[PDB]
Symmetry: D2
Subunit: 447 residues, 4 copies
């Protein structure tokens, strides 16, 4: 019934695992010869047959068909077509339950290396641009209200730091994914005394699963991957929100390149930050995959259950999504143009009310009291229709006699950001230190 089969994994999804499945079968065939189930004469026929399939796949031949239950079944059918009955010995002691997780892990191993590379390039793009644009200052925000002046590079580095934690989380997930489950059989293990150390070595896993029942029932590797990817997308969704708002004509801080923007087929004046919006939307898309698999696993009994097959489509979609989003984000950041003129112009006096308060603190006034006075000063300006940096010393002294002609030094945005030299701050020396820390972090991640 084409219907019930419509509910199982699709053709394109199964095809994506075709090569790793063949790689897994080659390792298994070799261990079977060592275990005495295959003679060297038979092993050779099987390897040659499997290489035959590997060759066809590289030629774009699609092996799996709607007739085949899955790639495992498709490759076994194809082998039998190429070499006859000997192909059936390869099935000895092997379960789809271990092949499915082995193939998925091999695929993830390969996919994460590629994702990792693109993520580091994204981080690097942010870091290198922060180095170059280090002298630029614009408003920093809390509640989307102007808070205090900060360096544009501090802003870029904020996102690089968050992405760097994501890179670290990816690495940790990779270690647990890098554990080989082949040899777990259907749930009880392998009964031929197969050499799992041999399979681990040939398939390049770091170690082998400890318990056969767990190895076949769990999808922790999937959840964990989806979770890390979701938090990564959350970071990108916040950075996209930032750039989309900064791209408004109202803010005017920057403009994306033509490559990462599109116009409107109706409104001739439009230039839209499509790339950013797309990236933001993927957070929901990836989160849905995490929610999906968590629910699929919840309350299922041991050990293997057919429900588990929902992992394949979720993993592949997220891999592809991530791989694309990352390059697009890299493209967006490296090619956007900032307006230093508008960023500078956005720097307004009120943002220095905190500095104005600290000024009084330096002269002995408790911050609580100084906070009040500074607000009173902002109020006084707001009342006479002027900026606080315009109030005369006299208007200031009427708030507090502690104000002196030196107060003028407060109304300077460079002086403002430069007071934040303590590690992590927006001062130039702190931004420089960050750039160095991230370069070393990225070096370590790459190692």
């Amino acid at each position: 019934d084409p219907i019930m089969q419509m509910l199982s994994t699709s053709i394109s999804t199964e095809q994506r695992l075709s090569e790793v499945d063949i790689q897994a079968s080659i390792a298994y065939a070799k261990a079977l010869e060592k275990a005495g189930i295959l003679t060297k004469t038979e092993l050779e026929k099987i390897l040659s047959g499997l290489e035959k399939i590997s060759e066809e796949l590289s030629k774009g031949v699609i092996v799996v068909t709607q007739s085949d239950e899955d790639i495992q079944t498709a490759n076994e059918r194809r082998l039998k077509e190429l070499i006859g009955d000997i192909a059936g010995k390869l099935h000895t002691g092997r379960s789809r339950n271990e092949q499915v997780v082995t193939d998925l892990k091999l695929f993830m191993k390969n996919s994460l290396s590629i994702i990792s590379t693109h993520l580091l390039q994204l981080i690097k793009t942010l870091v290198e641009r922060a180095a170059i644009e280090i002298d630029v200052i614009l408003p920093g925000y809390t509640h989307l209200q102007k808070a205090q002046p900060i360096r544009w590079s501090q802003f870029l580095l904020s996102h690089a730091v968050a992405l760097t934690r994501d890179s670290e989380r990816l690495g940790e997930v990779k270690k647990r994914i890098n554990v080989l489950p082949l040899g777990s059989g259907a749930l009880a293990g392998n009964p031929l005394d197969i050499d799992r150390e041999m399979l681990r070595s040939e398939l390049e896993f770091a170690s082998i699963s400890l318990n056969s029942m767990d190895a076949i029932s769990e999808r922790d590797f999937v959840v964990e991957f989806l979770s890390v990817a979701t938090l990564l997308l959350i970071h990108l969704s916040k950075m996209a929100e930032d750039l989309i708002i900064y791209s408004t004509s109202e803010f005017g801080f920057l403009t994306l390149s033509d490559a990462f923007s599109t116009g409107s087929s109706l409104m001739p004046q439009k230039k839209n930050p499509d790339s950013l919006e797309l990236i933001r939307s993927k957070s929901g898309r990836v989160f849905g995959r995490l929610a999906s698999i968590l629910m699929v696993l919840k309350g299922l009994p041991s050990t293997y259950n057919k429900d588990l097959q929902e992992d394949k489509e979720a993993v592949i979609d997220v891999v592809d999504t991530l791989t694309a989003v990352l390059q697009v984000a890299t493209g967006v950041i490296s090619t956007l143009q900032i307006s230093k003129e508008n960023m500078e112009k956005a720097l307004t006096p009120e943002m220095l009310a905190t500095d104005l308060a600290l000024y009084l603190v330096r002269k002995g006034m408790p911050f609580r009291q100084a906070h009040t006075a500074s607000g009173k000063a902002v109020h006084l300006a707001e009342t006479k229709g002027i900026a606080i940096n315009n109030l005369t010393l006299e208007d200031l002294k009427s708030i507090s006699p502690l104000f002196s002609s030196d107060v003028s030094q407060v109304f300077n945005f460079v002086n403002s950001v430069e007071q934040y030299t303590a590690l992590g701050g927006t001062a130039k020396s702190s931004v420089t230190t960050q750039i160095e820390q991230l370069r070393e972090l990225m070096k370590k991640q790459k190692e």
Copy 2:
């Protein structure tokens, strides 16, 4: 308006952070003296005042009130009540934006140590019981259908292995949580050249945040904790499903102790596995917290936003949930009674059809062909109204002449499980190895 204030964090939630907030303020006051904002005379008054509050909290005095915005505000108000205006200097350069994440991290640091301890006791309980009940064999399942015989200890260890990965994930989350954000100010950093190394040391964090904007905008530590906790609960929900099914009169494999079960106020014969059901239900509860915070963070602009305050209730609920569930799970596993008689009795012949097939494989028949023959044998039994272990050699030979009197050795459940000696399998030697690996793993985790 009591209404808009109803939407902010509650009293009991703010109170849970009262002591770490005081601990954070003490560290800050000291750095402020070093930074020249406080004289030794003032620092002493402030520390004494804060100790005063620490004393009151230990006496069960609730400091925060609906009048107070949050614990930070409540403690600052209380300090002012105890020592006067000098209390206001403590606010110098400090933002609620850094205090909120600092206090939450301190709380999580403390909560994870306690959760970790209980999780290891749960793992240990599973491992120690597996050692003792190592000779017990029962049916292993896939699709909730009898698959192959496995050791009850293999089953217990399956869950211990999964919990052990959770323990490892907890450790990784703990390292990123153990990074101190105090000194990030509102978003630009601290402007007094505060000694962050000094704060890190006194508050016991492993390091300090790299970027002030990120330190105040991110809640990765929260998401990550909620995510790891969710996967942990998923594991427990599957183990609960297992035990609930095994607790049915139909399976009859085991019975929970009176302590972890309840009766019915209407049906006098009932004995319900309440504990298990409760644990299973917490997976949804904890998942909801993860979904909650992910959505709260999605698309928010830099840096701090009031939305972020939803993290506190979610973290606390999950901590408390986890802390309780773990002890209950430990209680359930250590006190339940298995029926070795019913487990043994559940071992039926059909489960050895795979072994029956392998038997033919050993005699030269390809598994594919042997699989068919074994099924034919099961079919032959099913047709004459008997068990395959009852078929006479003659009925067997009619399926395949390769069957010999030695086939009798196939119908033995101990022989069945003992063939799975390859690492990870259900054989006794493999189960023993697992017990040792987990004891070393638990030793490492505890270190």
Copy 3:
């Protein structure tokens, strides 16, 4: 910027909306000529080409390519290849923002109609089977422990009742999806005084959208469908759990047919309930889609934002999933075979302990004490090897002097079940009434 396009929807997803897009464009064309933007002659040409594209689509021809942003641009580009510059007039006053919601809504109208047909068929299957096997009695469970005897038919009907509510919810969502958004333009509306009542009538919508900004910025209709589908699958995940457990050899109440079961390429004795498992798993799958659109929508500012383009794939996936799951469930319920023998055998005496306490309540003893007495009767039985069923009158007398020889009448399962005549109970008459109410309820839901 190819990869940027890798973030777009797939060619297959857009192809899925090809026919409704042509249909929507055909209506706008006629409304355009009426608005005087198109001569009666320019219309005939445009309309002529649209029918052509339609013929290509029906022949499997795929017009959308990797170069086309979406299906809308594909059709415009294709129509231009067919009639030249004149095809460009179709664009007057039209925006993709209104076309995507128009197209997706048309698609959901056609898909929901098909889903309803199958849903109602599933309910009927449960109802009819319930009528036939109405005499079968088996254990009822709470906490998966034997509670009180119920009729297999009560069981089948509880699921039919839940699914009937799903069907009711599906129709309510149908009404809101059936509002035309065409004419909202990019956000401000249409500046040609286009006749929306005409568009509505031709595209067969029940009414038109009240506000243009809302119409192209909202995806409530998507969220609702996904919510209703999710809850529907939750019901199915529960029914699947039930049948999967009842399918175990341990329970032995029923066995699925070979058509909805599958074997194991390793273990020759296996006969697995794949159909049920696949159904249960789609609950997570559909929930995942609901979760993504909710997140996509959250915190987005007005009006249209590119983020919204994620609705299509989620809606299509859930449509095909639900359509297939419903038919599979129908086949499962229809062809499964129950074991009246095992179901009857499962009826154990302790399940009548409540009735036993009630027996004492009728004799005057307070429920609390009666409950306690029944409790002791079952404990006295077990510790004695036998079941409360075989306990001698003396043994019962030992627990309470109220126990007379007429207590024997409590140990009858039909009687137990026949005790529940109050509406909704498991007594035969009540089950029969349910069957009639659901027959009527399905009748009422079809007539709309």
Copy 4:
């Protein structure tokens, strides 16, 4: 096993259901006497005590303690302390499985009624304000880029329209919650021929549950409420996003009142839109609750399972959250002040580029080419320092000979807006019509 009880619901949550539990017990008592389980005299006593417990509850007295499993057991235990063993008769044929769904439903009936009142008040606030400021025009956005001019009132109404659908959905959910489950017993129903029509009538439900197994095993009514609430909060998260951005100094369109704003204890110049942010954040909070119950329900077998007890805290949290969020939003919309000046100033010429292309379409030029011409006009303007608004006729002539001096008429924002008269558009007459439709729609929703 204390900690086991730490997994139970909280004392506060159970206390929240105290009054409805007493109310439900009062109905069952009368139905019991009628069923002959209680003498007319035993009833008067039982009923007498129940009213007493009710008086304690109204005096803030907390009856549920840490020792009590839930509120139901608390009330029974309390009633027993008041009248002795006789209170035990109330238990006949009753199960906690039916009491929890009965109690929670009663609670939701009372809570939903209050939520509706506030929701409709929020919509009216948006509607009335829309009527008053109907002449205000400002930028309309897509991708957060200036699109086409719209009326501030069109904007306010788009949100009112979305919220009106939420209100419609809330009432549909109300109907399904309004079905009485009392009388389903533990799962099999009631064995005393209890009068359900009597219970229904007294507890004020619209009808009774059709199947006892379904009634105590389902939580659809919970899932629905949470779904509707979630979508409702999504609308609010979007409106909040809008107003938060419009509140920036960069946009300067409006400013919230001091009552819905808050300062910074560090930065003395801050004035933050806390109310809006708090509202946006509750979208995640409520969604989280929907997600948990869906997961709680998923794959659970029939009928009752202890897992279901998680519904209470989720339902209560969402009720209080929604009730407060709605009033806060009403105050926000009501007291915010807009800057007609800044909104008018924001109107920039390029936003009329569509109208400019349309101007050429009226003169015969094909939309595609007209679009291109308009595009060049705006690029020609920018690269020239001025806006398409100031371009000389010659400059326009340079782009297309079709540009005459009457093109000047395109550069008027009222005209731009007044172009959208087709239903749902931003023209004044259309906005006025919307105001009337919503007034009627709110009227129709109250009358039920």
